[PDB]
Symmetry: C6
Subunit: 170 residues, 6 copies
């Protein structure tokens, strides 16, 4: 069990090597059988590892979060808990009834007070890709269903038994 | 060997630092009548030293939350009296005699560098301060015979220990 | 096993720790029209991030020189347009449209911190550039099938790889 | 080998553990007649070097407390006189000749950066010092044949060594 | 194998770690007509980078002394002209054409941060300068077929190499 | 192997990591007229570099004391003359001709950052300067045939070496 989790860390993720401010996209497979608590541990581990919002730096970066396969009932409720625990994010909807605004995701990438970025669906994700100009890397962790990632994006796909192992690899 | 049981329990549930992030860490230690007072104090001092950052260099300080159960109030209050005389300054939401539970005193003491940790008297004050803390809260449980019930929405670990003495090197 | 091949090529010729000095390092890759622009940009980003010191602390900055051969100008200009759009600012000796090759831009961009690396369009630009840098120059050539003819007075190492993807983790 | 029995003793029974913390650490060593003066001084210098922090950077200094038993007063005062000659300044609660025991001098000497450690003469001076200290106390006992009686409310560790020379490497 | 005897010749003869102090370190290489100028230049760049500390932070700079023997003056001057063109500024005691040997120029260049190393032309200039440095000197000699007769009061080490390529691995 | 014998002798008695202190360290070496002058210099230079801290940052400088026995005064004065010519400034309590032994110059030279080490001429000046240093004094004795007699109140160590060249590896 612990040797299965060791090979996935070293082969694909390379957490210590990669520190440049890249538009890193973390696509996670949210299902009904997994609970919100384990998703929040994965989100907190992704943000704490792949963002640098320290005051000393001059090139801050924040990760991008995308979830698929789940309903909007627990996707919005996970979003509601995360804002209550002072993990401030953006998703391109700064007010109620807004259209999707990629610029709010762009400014939140360099904003030190915004910890990560949420992406609601696939159409928000594809519209975000054409708006970021800097280098983008896509990391996907999934259990059953994968996602159609554009072929010109540097992509990795990682298969896990369930959602609990993702926070170790990240 | 006994060094291996400590090494397994130190890594299976507990992490060494949990990234040193300011989190509402709750340490629930199951105090018995058979457990000596001073071996609880060694566990409290080890928990406070490892799981708080009260240095002046930081701008995001944090302090652990301590809860004890399974023991009477006679030796529970006796433990709290000794910890105050040894300059281990804590708070429990009771700033004066005949006070109601003030969970905001635990909120300020979490960010206070002069308050080393936060004491929680019992279950009713434990659930009251759970709804007063908005930031991420984690519960660490160290029990021998009796395990408390934690709300299912919190990240919790439950670690069985042979006695109270081996809790000190796990944390 | 299988990863011992990549470890041996890393240890044999190309070491990052001892090469902290500002030399005019030339990196030559074999674009063979069968690898896409994705794996080329991963190799360029890894070469640039390792083999340049554009930090504001240092007073002797340096940037690598990048040369590609064996490919058409359609996907060479396609690769160059993507790199400039991704804020990886480079110079190729052509500061404006219709310009002749100006090697002084590659001289200035070598010591410039906002210029990340230097592009070389073809072999004729490469030979003209080598007469412009006075300080010590090294040539690192990575290729699969076709090897360039480097002049003999330069310190050169040649690395053969199975495909273009192995160059990323070698450097 | 002889290094192996002290290696497990240097880590398991006693260790560095919680250090750079201003605790009232009491070191109790068995000074005997067969143990000469020189190896006691090498043990005292090693205890002072490791278990005190008197640098000007800190604002929470601490110094160890030294207690000796099982020896005559003639070679106890000979050891105290030689340590004071080599600028290892200590206090024993007797600031002048014919003074009663003043534990306040050991209160100030514990936090004094210019006072390297604290001396305790016998058991009556040790018990009265314990009541005067309010902060956390730990008793580190090193003995060969006879072990001193310590109050049970204190954290105690007992080390039985083959001779006094092993104490300087254990501590 | 080749990587085993390389480490044995590296570790035993030359201790890289301890020698950080400013001593007048003389490096003697056995330049042959069969040895290419490019392979010599990599050894000089490796010798200079490892054995000089000309940073602006320090106050005790030092540079290695370089001596070559067994080769003609045609390629020795060609090697010296190539190193000066690559901004590897050296001195050799001949500040102008027709000058006599000035060991004082080698003395000033030893503490000069703008001068990277010191060239010595032949044996007679090597013996003349040895009476001019007063501080501690060491002679490191690398040779393949012909060895020099170093004066016996100097700390000398002699390394026999198969060819000139592995000298830069030792330094 | 032979490299073990240097490693056991180094690890058993002399540790650089554990001392790091302003102690009056005495290094007594056996100059026995069969080793030439030059190998004593690398021994003295290694002892001075490893066992002294004369940086401007520190407020507590220290320099080692060195004593040579068993050799004549012709090569002992000859060794002293080369060390002073190589800018290794020392003192021996004789600031002028006709001076009596002044151990004060060995005291101010101990705390002097311009005095690298202290020379002891013979056993008469060694015993006299022992009573002049108030601070803790340690004696390190390296010998091959004849061992000097050390007073029993000092921390002394005797290392038996095959020859003088192995001493600089131990220190």
């Amino acid at each position: 069990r612990k040797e299965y989790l060791r090979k996935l860390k070293e082969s694909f993720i390379r957490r210590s090597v990669n520190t440049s401010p890249y538009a890193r996209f973390f696509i996670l497979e949210f299902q009904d059988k997994t609970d919100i608590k384990t998703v929040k541990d994965c989100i907190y581990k992704i943000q704490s590892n792949w963002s640098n919002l320290s005051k000393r730096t001059d090139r801050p970066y924040s990760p991008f979060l995308l979830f698929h396969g789940t309903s909007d009932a627990n996707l919005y409720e996970l979003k509601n808990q995360l804002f209550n625990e002072d993990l401030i994010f953006t998703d391109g909807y700064p007010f109620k009834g807004s259209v999707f605004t990629p610029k709010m995701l762009i400014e939140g990438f360099s904003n030190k007070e915004i910890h990560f970025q949420f992406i609601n669906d696939i159409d928000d994700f594809n519209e975000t890709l054409n708006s970021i100009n800097i280098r983008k890397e896509v990391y996907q962790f999934y259990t059953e269903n994968c996602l159609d990632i554009p072929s010109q994006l540097p992509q990795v796909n990682i298969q896990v038994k369930d959602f609990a192992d993702i926070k170790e690899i990240v």
